[PDB]
């Protein structure tokens, strides 16, 4: 009876911007990954550290579901060791990522005539992210040496710029909804498996 709330994260309603990438832990639960193979509606489905055909019968100490919205070009950067605008200042995977990466198109739902501006991303950060770090600050990026003083000014940018999401866009600049499932291998009891 206790399915892992997967329609809660996948089917869902609102997703987060990638700078404020949303995360759900699911403890004490059996997980139906069967409804994720036989789907076909995923454009990319990558799995790092484990085959997903194996996934219905290992035991893990928790799984985290990370989820967000990015352009279709930026999905590649949702991978171990990818360089990039999303990987560095928005959402970094560890290089030793056990887990999987699931993404699909959402123009019929997220791309609005006139421009759905409502999703956005970090253009500018001082340091890169640590894996699974989350950055929320609206602190003005000091792009030059001339200081910023909290004002959007000379060499001083608001570090978050928008996605402008028209449904008329190219295959690159679409809106995509991504779900990252990570699997921690703790030296600890299993709370989530599936048989």
């Amino acid at each position, epitope marked *: 009876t206790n399915l892992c709330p997967f329609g809660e994260v996948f089917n869902a309603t609102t997703f987060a911007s990638v700078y404020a990438w949303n995360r759900k832990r699911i403890s004490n639960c059996v997980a139906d990954y069967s409804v*994720l*193979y036989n*789907s076909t509606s*995923f454009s990319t*489905f*990558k*799995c*790092y*550290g*484990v*085959s*997903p*055909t*194996k996934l219905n019968d290992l035991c893990f100490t928790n799984v985290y579901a990370d989820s967000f919205v990015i352009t279709g070009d930026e999905v*590649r*950067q949702i*991978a*171990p*060791g*990818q*360089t*990039g*605008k999303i*990987a560095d200042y928005n959402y970094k995977l560890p*290089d*030793d*990522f056990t887990g999987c990466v699931i993404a699909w198109n959402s123009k019929h739902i997220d791309a609005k005539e006139g421009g759905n501006f409502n999703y956005l991303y970090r253009l500018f950060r001082k340091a*890169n992210l640590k894996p699974f770090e989350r950055d929320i600050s609206t602190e003005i990026y000091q792009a030059g040496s001339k200081p910023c003083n909290g004002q959007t000014g000379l060499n001083c940018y608001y570090p978050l710029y928008r996605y402008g999401f028209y449904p008329t866009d190219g295959v*690159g600049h679409q809106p995509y909804r991504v779900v990252v499932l990570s699997f921690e291998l703790l030296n600890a009891p299993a709370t989530v498996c599936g048989p």
Partner: antibody
Amino acid sequence: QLQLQESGPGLVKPSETLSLTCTVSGGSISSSNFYWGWIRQPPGKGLEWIASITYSGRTFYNPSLKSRVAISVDTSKNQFSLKLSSVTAADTAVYYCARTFPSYYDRSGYHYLNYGMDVWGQGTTVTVSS
Amino acid sequence: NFMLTQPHSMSESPGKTVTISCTRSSGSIASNYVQWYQQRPGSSPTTVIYEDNQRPSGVPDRFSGSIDSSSNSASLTISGLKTEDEADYYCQSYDSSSWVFGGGTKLTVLG
């Protein structure tokens, strides 16, 4: 980021064993998501792959070379090594250590691994001369 | 195993679109991933196209890679050609026995 700096003798008198080492910074070589390779470039000629290795020991080889090729992960000092033996003039080349794209599985479960190079070294030069 | 044959030399005007082909001699081209690398002279290579049509980051949007199953070719497309693209372009594909590189396409920008 991910910097890749080679270590070579520059000189390998012939019929001997050439050792290169690829020092890695900004990333775990112990990660089993990636593979780690050597590409050589003999001078003014094209590129060929030598061998690739992941940390599990699972290891792929160019078969025209595989007889003379050995490779290993020096995981304490975060670096990996090419050992090529019984070299000749045809082993004069710029040797590039590189890092592949991440090994993954599709939703059908087919394993994609060691298929192409993401990040490159600067290269090191090996001249084989007596 | 298989060969990957690239034309040795191409020349095209600035701003125009050039396409480097990459013809697998043996086996269908859509069964293995195709990578494209650029080499400026005396420089290390860098990856411009991996997984047939993806780019790593910092590769401009004017780089695209495509596949033709009819001619059994992978194509690399540079559209809006610069002064600065003048490079050796190697296509690489693999299988689980060996990798194969092409021989090199030395690209030259005219004008």
